Structure formats: C-alpha cells, structure tokens
C-alpha cells in the first residue's frame, strides 16, 4: 500500500475530514484513490463521502442491509446524539450559511457570525430571560456544545464564530426532510 | 468480509485488548484469521499480537502515530504500577485472576511516600490511584471485600526499556 494513501487515510480517520484549503496534498491523494480508500474502509463499516465543489472529503457510517441500524450504535462513534435545542441552532446556522454562500463569488473566504445576531432569533423560539448575562451564558454554552461536533469554532477576540462547511452535508435536503417528517409526527400527538 | 471478523476487529480497535474469558466468539474468530486481520490492519500501520498462554489479543504499532497518543505517568502512578506488576508476577508464579486487597498496598505505598497519619487519607489516595489506573484499563472493578483484579495485560505492560526505567525509579525511591 502506497505511503501517501496510508497517510491520508490515517489523517482523515484522526480528524474526520479533509479540506482542500488546509491540506491540499492529502486531499488530492485521497481524491484520486476512491476505490482503494473504499476497500480499506469496508472492513470497519465506514465509507468516504466526497464534495468536489466545496473541496471536502468526510467519513460516514457505511449503510448496511438492516432496515434500521440507527447509525449511532457503531462502536467507533464516540460523540453523543443531537437534541432539539442543538438541532434548532443548527438550522439557524444553516440559514446563515445559505445567506453567506448565495452572495459569494470566486475567491476564498469564511462564514463569520456574531453572537448578538444569533441571540434575538433564538429568543423568538426559546423565550426571553431577565438579564443579558443569562442569555449570553446560554448562547455560549450552546455554541460550546456544538463545537464538539466540528460545526463551529471557538469565539474570537471580536466575539465571532466560524461556520464550518461540513454543516452543508449535515443539513442536506434528505436529512432535513427526515427531520421535518419526524418532528411533524412528534407535534401532532 | 465475514461479519464476525469485522465485529472482532472493531471491538479490538475500540478497546485495544481481547480476552477469551470475556468474548470467546470474537477471540476464536480473530485467532483463526490471523492473515485476514493483518491485511485489514496493514493500511492503518497496526498489527495484532497474540498470547495464547492467557488468551490475550492486543494491538501493536507495526514499524509517533496519528491515531495513538503517548502519555507519561507520575511517580505516584509508576510505583503503584511496579507494585501491581510484581504482585501479578508472584500470583502467576503460583501454579486464574490475581486478587489484590486494598489494605495490602497501603504499607507498600506508605514505605515510599511516607505516612499521611490518617486511615481516610490512605484510603482516598489508594482509591484515586486505582481509578486512575482503571482509566488505563489495567485493573478490573473493585470487589465487595475491598479487592481488585489484575488484568493479564500487565504481562505486556510495556517493552523492557520501560521495565528497566521502572525498576531504576523504584530502586531510587527505595534509596530515598
């Protein structure tokens, strides 16, 4: 097995994804060896997902013949599940990412969002607390929880966060449709 | 790829150790398919090590590794590791599972770290050290009669380089 293929596979398994704008060599190596990487990851019940438009390569749970495997009981998955509050915040961030990606042209940039923009839109649904410090603590805690899934970054000195492109593959239309169906079932009885 | 082979490989990669007494089916599947496991773990720069004497299957870095973090342990953990290793060696020289009472190790810890002057302090120190070693998966759960079980992995605790370092540190501590 070639050294570069092994290095790229190990790096991707370690971090969970490869981005072209940060690790171009490994991204190119892993992009041109789809069959080899798939054969390597088959024994581990894992698969590789590709996105050439955004320059992204990520790792997902391989789909089995069982109708429902729940995709979270896989032994190698270490994170916890996602509850309703985090799903709501993810939906808000996805809307912001749509807005960012629509009005962009050729060139490299990043999606930055300030907390003060996020606070009122979440107040609309969750409600309002007495002081401002309470709401700031709530938002900071939620963003810290979301950082563990690799969806955002830590707060800057100017009180801003970066939205990672991987969210575009977490809230793709299929997953959104499934979530909407499930939530509609939950609400109506 | 057979389902049992994949299950055994995934379990071993999750835990790092396989014992026949705990998961006999996975142990049998892994021990009868050495070449398949080696082929599977080759791209990940990992290899399988077998100890049929105790039924222990472990993973070694075949050749500082992207998937593995190196750690260093303090003297308060190193001397307890030495004590547990020598206790397990004494137990296996007598010929199952090595059972060590909590009160047994208290004098051995006091003769090297001094006496705290309180039974509660000694109990808390022993419990904290045992929990820290439980984090590394070196001992089993505490028994009802204040006893712990030493896992066979202590036999392959490290290479002889670390054993030499451990015995040198133990001798220096005994010197005081």
């Amino acid at each position: 097995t070639p050294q570069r293929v092994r290095e790229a596979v190990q790096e991707m398994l370690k971090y969970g994804l490869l981005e072209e704008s940060h690790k171009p060599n490994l991204y190119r190596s892993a992009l041109t060896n789809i069959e080899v990487v798939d054969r390597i990851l088959e024994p581990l019940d894992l698969a590789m997902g590709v996105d050439e438009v955004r320059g992204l390569v990520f790792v997902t749970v391989r789909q089995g013949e069982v109708a429902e495997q729940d995709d979270w009981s896989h032994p190698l998955v270490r994170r916890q599940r996602l509850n309703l509050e985090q799903s709501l915040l993810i939906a808000i961030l996805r809307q912001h990412f749509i807005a960012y990606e629509q009005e962009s042209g050729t060139g490299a940039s990043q999606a930055l969002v300030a907390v003060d923009e996020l606070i009122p839109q979440l107040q609309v649904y969750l409600g309002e607390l007495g002081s401002e410090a309470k709401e700031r603590n709530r938002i900071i805690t939620l963003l810290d929880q979301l950082k563990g899934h690799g969806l955002v970054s830590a707060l800057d000195a100017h009180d801003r966060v970066i939205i990672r492109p991987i969210i575009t593959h977490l809230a793709n239309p299929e997953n959104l449709q499934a979530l909407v169906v499930w939530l509609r079932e939950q609400v109506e009885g | 790829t057979p389902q049992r082979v994949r299950e055994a490989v995934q379990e071993m990669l999750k835990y790092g150790l396989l014992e026949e007494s705990h998961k006999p089916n996975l142990y049998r599947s892994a021990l009868t398919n050495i070449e398949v496991v080696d082929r599977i773990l080759e791209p990940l720069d990992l290899a399988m090590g077998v100890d049929e004497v105790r039924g222990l299957v472990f993973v070694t870095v075949r050749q500082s590794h992207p998937l593995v973090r190196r750690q260093r342990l303090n003297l308060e953990q190193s001397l307890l590791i030495a004590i547990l290793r020598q206790h397990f060696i004494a137990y296996e020289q007598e010929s199952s599972q090595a059972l060590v009472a909590v009160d047994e190790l208290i004098p051995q810890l006091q003769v090297y770290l001094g006496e705290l002057g309180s039974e509660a302090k000694e109990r808390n120190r022993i419990i904290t050290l045992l929990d820290q070693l439980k984090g590394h998966g070196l001992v089993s759960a505490l028994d009802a009669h204040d006893r712990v079980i030493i896992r066979p992995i202590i036999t392959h605790l490290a290479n002889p380089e670390n054993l030499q370092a451990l015995v040198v540190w133990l001798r220096e501590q005994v010197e005081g």
Binding site: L170 | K14, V59
Partner: peptide, 27 residues
C-alpha cells in the same frame, strides 16, 4: 419551556465521524 423536551434526542445522522480518539492503547 420544559427541559425534558429540549434534551429529547432528535434524528440526524453522524457526519464527519472522527475515530474514537485512540485504539485505547496508550503505551
């Protein structure tokens, strides 16, 4: 307004699955 519903698990698949930290063999 209920903490029970805010922490109820939702349905969203694991994407970008990182490995389980280590193979649990520190050495």
């Amino acid at each position: 307004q209920r903490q029970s519903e805010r922490r109820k698990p939702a349905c969203l698949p694991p994407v970008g699955v990182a490995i389980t930290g280590v193979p649990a063999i520190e050495r």
